[model samples]
Target chain A: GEIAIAIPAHVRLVMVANDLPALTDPLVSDVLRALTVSPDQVLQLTPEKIAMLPQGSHCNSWRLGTDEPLSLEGAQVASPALTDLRANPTARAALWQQICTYEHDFFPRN
Target chain B: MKNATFYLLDNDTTVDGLSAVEQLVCEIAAERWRSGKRVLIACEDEKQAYRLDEALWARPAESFVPHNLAGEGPRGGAPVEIAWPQKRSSSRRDILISLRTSFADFATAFTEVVDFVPYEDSLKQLARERYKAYRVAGFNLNTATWK
Candidate 1:
């Protein structure tokens, strides 16, 4: 049921959930801190900021800082979850798996 | 009226043939001879300026007024115009040419000089190709101007 997230080649940096509740999440925080990414390289994606992303096949959404009913498509997507990413090799591999698992948990694929 | 012309010189010449310093001096001398106007030779270094001064003094070509603007205390008060070379604009070859051309244009405008002779030939085209190569290597062109 895991969906592969491909990071785009042009994305040099990435943003993830940064709200207090999201940051308090052990799994999210642990993955972010252990990803070997520099502080300057990561951006926080708050609930209010999720609407700014363009709507298209090129983008995906994730649920980070909201208590609303989890919908299948309203979640924020990370940029280039699987392709041409600037993350270190180890971090990239870990991120790829984490994203796939997260997606599978939210919306199981056949 | 006698029309004076300025010829662009190539920098590949040796000291004996037409070095940059020598070419600058020669251009100034030629301009003065044809137009009876004072010509200024600007160089990036004092060494080159002094070299041009020596060439000017050695010959002191009649009908031409030569001046060195590289260092202090002009030997004969011929109006020296000292100027340091500007920092390079960008690693992009085309941008470099564009910047040089713009600089030359500014120099001509400021000095009311009609001609600008750079040391390099096909400078614009060379700069464009160089810029492409630098871009291929993932280098950004820091400065580029159209005018």
Candidate 2:
């Protein structure tokens, strides 16, 4: 039997929430637009999947649905919960701006 | 098992449209093949395995690396073999170019193991984990940042 293979992505959406935000959700659509990546280009990982991942797996990762302190000394960007983003318009805007500014970091030319 | 030497190359530079890590894998594989070493490149999946196979083929014919997916071509495999998930290498066990994040159990079988420390933070952390694991496993490890 073949082992599970992790697909590569420019950006990883680490969902701390139990359910993935629907693609039609405004927050999700905005994020996709800001990152200039299609939904398929993003590798969305759930908490269960995250636990199985080998440490040091590579990707431009953003942890959603959690306000917890950053992991890896801030190696990965941690965002508010998906519910929080949807409820608070300003928070969503802030995240959108942040992702847009650091978009290059997510996909390095070099 | 004999202590295998692990080479950790730190490369954050990209060239000719290939990511830095991909370029490093190909260069290392080519150099190893030229030195008469049978090489095995372990990718994350079949897609990655075939992608790399095509990349090797795309190289200039004069400096081409003779490679194939693990189960294809002549017996004993090509000078370089691209492997993924369930695809096992036949006899190319001299150099192992690991494209996957974590090292596999059979990795110790190779004479030399090549891994990368990519630029991304998550990736760097992953590579660090492998480095530490190799040390605990009693493998001889060498590391250098590529220019």
Candidate 3:
């Protein structure tokens, strides 16, 4: 409870996948770009890396390819695996619905 | 009711996993212990009771909170004790952290009570019942949402 490090403010979003390549999947990249989120603004992690985070670290986080909800505290959301999102249009729409909440901060404005 | 003060902390969160609640309970216990007060975590069952026992052990070193299962520690007990309905503690503690579905009457023994409200509709209903029950009991209750 005491003396735990907070996630850097610059890291606005955290993306977790089974592997780095999955994190870099084309659709995933496109989504991030569309959201106006820079690569540096997101932290890419695996399930193992998640434990390294300090308890109660607050961040807009998404878990990919992991059906289970994140047990960590924060605005954590879960979606189908990257492979499924690539093949299923319905899933893609759902993903958009979840991530769009962050779009206003990143979407291009006139 | 020793004027009991009965300071209640109604922490609001969503129904997620046992780990989330287990960790939250330990954090509360750690704070209470740091202030030199003993904490009794009344879990809903044995499974939860032991899970929290393990969660306390798993806290980061610097933030480690000394704790034990209610009847398993030293003669007087550790700074924090975890118990369930079937396995209860008779020791005096200043704080009670409850993770059960209903309001616990035994809470009257402590000066402070900490409870949670989960997001799942049915689960949240149970929390409201406890909230209302505590109010009727006249606790100086304080509620907050912890993200």
* Chain B TM-score against the true chain B, each candidate: 0.43, 0.85, 0.83
Stretches of candidate 2 off by over 4 Å are A1-110, B1-17, B60-62
* TM-score ranking from best candidate downward: 2, 3, 1
Tell me the tens digit of each residue's lDDT in model 1 across B1-147: 111123344454565434653545554454443343334444444565555544543333221122334333222222323233532211101111111222233232222232234456655454445444444444333431111
Q: Can you write out model 3's per-residue Cα lDDT over A14-109, one digit (the tens) per residue?
A: 888885554355566655643445667888877766777787666667787887665456556567777666666456545544544544433324
lDDT of 2 at B77: 65
- Best by the lDDT measure: 3
TM-scores of the candidates are 0.29, 0.51, 0.50
Candidate 2 lDDT over A12-104, as tens digits, reads 544334567666565565455444446666666665665555555555556676555323222355567776655554454356445545645
Query: Which ten residues in a row are the worst by lDDT in model 3 chain B?
Result: B2-11
Write the residue-wise lDDT of candidate 1 on A1-110 in tens digits: 13433334443224444432333343343334333233344445554444453433232333333434222243333422212222333333334344434443323345
What DockQ, on C-alphas, does every prediction get? 0.00, 0.01, 0.01
Clashing pairs in 2: A56-B126, A65-A81
What docking class should model 1 receive?
incorrect
Chain A accuracy as TM-score for every candidate: 0.31, 0.66, 0.73
lDDT of each: 0.36, 0.63, 0.65
Which candidate number maximizes TM-score? 2
Q: Candidate 3 at residue A16, lDDT? A: 82
